[model samples]
Target chain A: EPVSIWMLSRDQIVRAAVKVADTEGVEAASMRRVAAELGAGTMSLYYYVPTKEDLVELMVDEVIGETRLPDRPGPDWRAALTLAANEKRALWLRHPWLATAWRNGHPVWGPNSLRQQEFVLGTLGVFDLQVDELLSLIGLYNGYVESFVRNEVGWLEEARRTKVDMREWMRRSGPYAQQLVDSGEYPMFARVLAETVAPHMGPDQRFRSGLERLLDSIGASLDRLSP
Target chain B: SIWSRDQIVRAAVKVADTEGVEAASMRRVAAELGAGTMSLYYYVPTKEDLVELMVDEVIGETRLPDRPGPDWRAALTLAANEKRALWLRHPWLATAWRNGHPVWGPNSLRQQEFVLGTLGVFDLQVDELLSLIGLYNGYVESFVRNEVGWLEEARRTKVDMREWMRRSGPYAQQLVDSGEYPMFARVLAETVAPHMGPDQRFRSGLERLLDSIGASLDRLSPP
Candidate 1:
């Protein structure tokens, strides 16, 4: 019979790190905390995962693994890209603390990160865009989401602390908001504000509209690319 | 009587603008004004109240554009530009605005009402008006933050866009050379070295956003 002995699995360390991240934040997920949460000494974790940075890399990859892409085909490239964006937004909502790690860049080439990219790349394949345009579109989309999600998180934090809904806050800050409008400096922005539906103006609405408009730009580029 | 609310807020704003927000504590503001921290309490009531007053005072400095007709695009674009300018001028404003609770002072309310009124020119409903304005503000805030990031990066690296591109050009070129990230590589090759400037990218994206919004409006109204 082969000799067998139980050792601390990589999965156990990752689970503890994630628990800390979920409750406190990415910054709070220290190796010591992870070890304590796992009922193991801090030095023992190092035996499994070399350093704190290595553990962070693993935790990020694990959380990213949770995001699921839709199997149903998108109506077109635009629809497909929108699906990817919505999926990303949902992932961000689930792991609000993940934003800090994401800002640092994808640490590990984990399965989920690869899968997400593949889905996005595959979606772009449906359009007649040149590889360069497709890449720019993807970069721009990702950059926009990074900023958008940060704003959404900030707004939510403010709401929680101040005990005010976003709409009510905007309504109360009407004058300052109006300064943004009447400034005549951003006429297009002012017009959009003037014409937009309120229900369609919240963070969720803005995300959807911005994503749609972004995909629309890609579609326009595709139209140009075709003959 | 000598130390009033305005005096304290003025001293606070001065401290914030020069030394940064973190330096603008109640004690600091009081010392600057030659008053005690307790005296500040007499004028502002609480730290939170002081913050509210400071935000309103800072916002009061933002200038509204002169009268423009029903040219919604021009109006909105100008508003965004003005806000961007304000943010650039007052780096502290970005943090202050972001941190403050969503309470509108007179100036802020006037701005929102003006935007709503501007959209009303196009006969959009209240909801539609709100959405349009929200999107516009969101875009402006994002643009300002990115600009700040680029500026800070430039200062820290002591390298402008061209030099930075040259350094990263090889890595970028390698990806292109390998036919991986081909699209990104091409764009970098075409624009990175000599022709790339911040304005073009910013303007192009802004125009595209407006174009999309315009197209949406047209669809809503078929004459």
Candidate 2:
């Protein structure tokens, strides 16, 4: 073991911080805790990462770097976006804290975030739409992906906390669901309970099915705008 | 202070509203109520249960008619406006990040009925209707989530949104000059929503989402 503090790297601090967060949560990955884990002084870490927010931003970008995507998303925007959606879903599933982390203003333009954005935005590069339209469409795509993943992660957290998974929870609520249906008050909700099959499918199947519907919505927008 | 579950939930919500959700711990809430921590647990079993109760408590704030009126667009717009206002009033809800299951609270169920009823007249399949409503909710929550994030940031940093944007200009320009992020650069150059007032931006964005939803409806069942 060397007696010098010069060996520590920002990447090392960030990676160790993520390890702590991945287990406990973002709140547990304090500068002091991270330094304790890395065998460095907390003051020394402040020299590199500076603040908790900065460390979180770095951690988010670092995990995003784990996402596997092509350098360039080739033709067929649908296919490209589908690949992106799946990748993003998988990434968020792996790093569940991402669903709750808040970034203040503008997108995180860290290298990985930037590269991912470029590829996803470039999926629609050939369309003759204005930048605002492009942003709206991409926002829609992102909104769907993020919301779905957030709920999935929520369920994951709930399952981990209480030993009840979605299916069991649904089964437990069946009598109450029937009570509301019998009330004849929530006709629409009754239909959802009776006719909807998406909730019954496995998580991946439900995700892909929702993704298809969202993509169809985007395709409809493109047809109207570009035609 | 009163030994009821409702009183405990109210005290907890008050603490969370002022100090954040994390600060509203059982010990802290018990202190707020001048009650013992163990006795408080008699009313609210766990922190997780407290959070769900808090969420449902706030969802009770949203005011909508018993049934959505005939004009689906107007009804949905009303619901969206109320939802945003509710989030603004209780910023903690944005960060609460609810579990996958819907809250079984009476107020939550009532609001959900109103929203789902907005499109009940349409002859759409249940799945399509769910997807469409999901899109509507996704847009509203995503927009308000960022808005609340900015509000919280401003409180911490003592720098409001405009000042942050003004300060970021030079750095944003530097990124554009680098020419590495064409999509981002175009956004900086051409995006209009960022400049608009929050209300204007939200209304216009909501319209765009509604238009997309309309397009889907038309394709699914030609009018």
Candidate 3:
């Protein structure tokens, strides 16, 4: 008969750590706290996970597993990529603290993580880019989504921390920007801010327009240029 | 209190670089100088201001091209690399109010000038120039964050990397096994040399970006 621990599983402990990082900030994600959440002894946790660092590694993979990659590459590569980008963007937003993990920490290469990258690498394979080029494209696109969500989530965190809304934070800081604009330092920024015809782009608009531009760059132009 | 603004910012950035950004508290900076928090405040008003000053200081470190040649792709790539270098020095900048904060300091504006100046050579429309540089800077700002983060992560797990990978599953495992994530699995298992030197990888990525921009302008929505 095989015996497995039922009181606290690996998934539960790692998931508890994930909850702490998401609800509180990642800074507060100490092993002691994670253990308390698991209702397990800290010493017991030490046996399960070697170090707090290892727990974090476990936690990152667990959260990354939440990202759902597409089943197969669609016929149109651009649409597939845009869908992938949007899917990732949605996942990052779900777990705000996941931003740092995505940036600063490498995953533990959990089964799901392998699955996630496989989805991206697999979908991008539909295009004409070579293996290296495909890898490069993935880097660029992931960075875009991560950076976008990092900023997006950062604003939300800032607003929550300061008891201010996102727009209100801008209102507080807008004057300095205006004063800077008056100084003629950021000439280009000032010009853009002054454009009455230009409306603020929401996240969807930015992603669609930008991703289209990138897809056209990779898919259409490259094919036309080389082959 | 009696310290200059530069002294304060330099101390904070040093603390951030060495100890991590969270350690860059006003009280910590003050203690580093055997000064009081209130006095430090007189020198630098808020933590946000200190960050702004630090950003300005770091942004100034990037050296722009003295004279850009007519090679638009190479010129822009050079500038992009310069920007990436600066971000890697201060990876914490990605978490800073990159989009929230307004432009400040001469060097910040100067970065804009050089990017636009390089793009100036191209026969792009006004909005085209704006959109191009906008995408470029935003891309560089975001992309380098991952590069530095990965570097920091690599540094942290140097020892006892025992738990890193292969606890994962076997060949063509997980979604790859299920055929759910085919492209992803192949790249992971089959793609040769996924990890390249940072500069080499970055330059290639930037090249792709520039080409994409070129293709977008000519092929899709053209003059």
Candidate 4:
């Protein structure tokens, strides 16, 4: 007969912390609050988790685990990457609270996070990308998604409060937004936005476009590497 | 003349709009209203309560579609657009919303109801509708927050992002020239060479998401 410890684990405390984080922002996920949820004294949680950082690390790993890796095989490398990013973005939405804690500089190197990174790195490796190139692509892609997701959350909260539409805001702020354009700073950005067709385009389009362009550029690298 | 709760909240909102949430404390709000902080406390239990009230009050200002029908796409688009405007107006809200819990306050609930009502026009069940709305919110929130950050960063740097990239051209160029990051280098040289703004990227991503969601819904429904 196999023996099982079956002891009450720290999973309950972590779950409570996640609940607090999911509802409140990361800062609000206090030990006391989580302990209250567990019907245990706040001090007791110390036995389960050593510190707040540990709890947060666990939470970050748990949330990252939620992202489903690509299942379908044989999609081109770019397609696979795109699908993986979309799935990750979907998961980010489910747990907006995690956004506060996730930092590209300090990625949680837990099993789930490592697996996700491996998946991304492994997919790019199919293109025969060297380790350095693969890591760079991963960093850039991660940065883009992190920045992108953070902004989306901020926008939704603002809309919830002020009840103003983003497009109209753009139109009203066009002169201001245009002033930045007219400043001749980012000529490329100015040109893109100047197009009438620009406003109708959405986040996914932007992400896909960037992703494609990135892959195209990578393909160019592959050519360079080949000959 | 005396100030009403609306007046106080509005004034507080103004401070928040210009400065940030950290600066919009009760003491600061009281100063704005020319009242004592203790006096303001008479109306508000605590600073947190005041923030909640302020959030609710400002959210009340948002105008929902008069008659949201089965046009879930249109409704969500309108919501996304409207929310972006609000973020631009009250930059502090971007931070405040994240700090608070997910409880649907009166205003938030109304917004949720608007979304649910719009989806109801379709044959989506409550679960599907919830998921759809969740996806929509995720897209919008991520997009808008980046916009605010870019604007803030630009304001701070007092230079445009692309120009900053160009001026730091040496640094960025050197990083690319390292020859180790071939893919990143190529991508930067080809796609981002001209440089893109937060807004352009945001618009593109939003449209693609809507397309993906619409396609999913279509698949879910049978003829």
Compute DockQ for each candidate against the true complex: 0.11, 0.50, 0.38, 0.03
- The worst-scoring run of ten residues by lDDT in candidate 3 chain A lies at A1-10
Evaluation by TM-score, superior candidate among 1 and 4: 1
How would the candidate models be sorted by lDDT, starting from the highest?
A: 2, 3, 1, 4
The best candidate by lDDT is 2
Q: Once superposed on the true structure, which residue ranges of model 4 sit more than 4 Å away at CA?
A: A1-227, B1-4, B98-100, B174-200
- lDDT for each residue of candidate 4 in B1-223, tens digit (9 for 90 to 100): 0106667778888888888777888888999999988778777766656676677777788988755776666777788778888777876666564431233345655665665566656664444454455456656765566556656656754554455454554654664555444444544555531344555655555564555456556556632
- Isolated chain A: TM-score per model? 0.80, 0.93, 0.83, 0.81
What's the lDDT for all of these models? 0.62, 0.83, 0.65, 0.61
TM-score, per-candidate, Cα-based: 0.65, 0.94, 0.81, 0.52
Clash total of candidate 2 = 0
Error of 2 at B171 (Å): 2.1
Interface RMSD of each: 8.7, 4.9, 5.4, 16.5
Segments of candidate 3 deviating more than 4 angstroms: A1-7, A64-67, A103-108, A163-166, A169-174, A196-199, A225-227, B1-3, B65-70, B91-103, B120-131, B138-143, B159-185, B188-196, B220-223
Between candidates 1 and 3, the one scoring higher on lDDT is: 3
Count of clashing pairs, candidate 3: 7
For model 3, what share of native contacts is present?
0.40
**Ranking of models by DockQ:** 2, 3, 1, 4
